[PDB]
């Protein structure tokens, strides 16, 4: 649902 970044939902991560 996102790249390997904190926000699973990719909320401007």
């Amino acid at each position: 649902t996102c790249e390997i970044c904190a926000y699973a939902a990719c909320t401007g991560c």
Side-chain angles (χ1 to χ4, degrees):
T1 44
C2 192
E3 300 74 20
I4 307 180
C5 196
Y7 310 151
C10 229
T11 329
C13 198

